[PDB]
Amino acid sequence: ACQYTMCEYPHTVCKSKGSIRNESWHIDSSEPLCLFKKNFTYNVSADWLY
Amino acid sequence: PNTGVYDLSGFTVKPVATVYRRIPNLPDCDIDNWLNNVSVPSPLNWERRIFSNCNFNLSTLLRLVHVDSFSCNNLDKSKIFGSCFNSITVDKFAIPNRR
Numbered sequence: 001a002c003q004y005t006m007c008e009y010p011h012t013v014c015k016s017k018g019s020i021r022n023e024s025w026h027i028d029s030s031e032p033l034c035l036f037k038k039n040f041t042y043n044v045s046a047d048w049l050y
Numbered sequence: 051p052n053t054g055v056y057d058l059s060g061f062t063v064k065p066v067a068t069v070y071r072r073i074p075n076l077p078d079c080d081i082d083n084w085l086n087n088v089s090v091p092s093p094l095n096w097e098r099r100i101f102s103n104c105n106f107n108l109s110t111l112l113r114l115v116h117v118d119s120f121s122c123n124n125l126d127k128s129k130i131f132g133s134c135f136n137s138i139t140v141d142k143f144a145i146p147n148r149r
């Protein structure tokens with residue numbers, strides 16, 4: 001949860017087979033004010049995620 | 051007063067001290083994992099890192115690196131321990147002895 005300089009046409013790109021484009025949803029190389037930051041781990045062999 | 055049975059509030063307990071627990075949102079900056087780095091730069095090409103959006107204190111810092119002095123300026127040394135700044139920018143280099 002941050003103050004993200006979000007782009008106009010945001011999208012992502014899978015990192016097993018790289019696409020033509022690149023991940024461009026923010027150009028924010030300024031480390032902006034973040035009210036929250038965290039990382040969690042889940043199952044890679046799971047069917048669904050709720 | 052008359053004869054009778056009366057109910058009187060006698061003070062019995064009072065809270066001694068408090069317990070405080072809170073889960074942190076942001077992470078530890080680990081300044082001392084940078085100040086104890088091996089490759090120390092010389093006063094021509096000093097480094098700088100910008101520790102921002104994390105949590106820190108001072109006591110584990112200044113006992114985990116072998117301090118010889120800690121002055122301050124435009125500040126009071128106990129005003130660190132409370133407040134919440136916006137970033138910290140540590141710039142280190144080695145010292146030539148006669149200068």
Ligand SMILES: *[C@@H]1O[C@H](CO)[C@@H](O[C@@H]2O[C@H](CO)[C@@H](O)[C@H](O)[C@H]2NC(C)=O)[C@H](O)[C@H]1NC(C)=O
Pocket residue numbers: 037038039077
């Ligand atoms: C959460 O996990 C991601 C991915 O594992 C971390 O992003 C990596 O951060 C390191 C150090 O900054 C970079 O060298 C990698 O290139 C990053 N990977 C990707 C895919 O971006 C991220 O730092 C983790 N966040 C926290 C708070 O630990």
Ligand SMILES: *[C@@H]1O[C@H](CO)[C@@H](O[C@@H]2O[C@H](CO)[C@@H](O)[C@H](O)[C@H]2NC(C)=O)[C@H](O)[C@H]1NC(C)=O
Pocket residue numbers: 083084087088089
């Ligand atoms: C001390 O600082 C240097 C930065 O000068 C850190 O060096 C990095 O080491 C990793 C090792 O995998 C390299 O991939 C990076 O490219 C290095 N960074 C740079 C800017 O060259 C070093 O890790 C620091 N020491 C500790 C203990 O964190």
Ligand SMILES: *[C@@H]1O[C@H](CO)[C@@H](O)[C@H](O)[C@H]1NC(C)=O
Pocket residue numbers: 020021022
């Ligand atoms: C994606 O980024 C790389 C590196 O900046 C660049 O070489 C490449 O041309 C970019 N792809 C597109 C479609 O612009």
Ligand SMILES: *[C@@H]1O[C@H](CO)[C@@H](O)[C@H](O)[C@H]1NC(C)=O
Pocket residue numbers: 043045046047
């Ligand atoms: C979730 O992970 C466990 C081991 O961590 C594994 O036994 C289980 O098969 C995984 N779930 C699915 C749906 O595969």
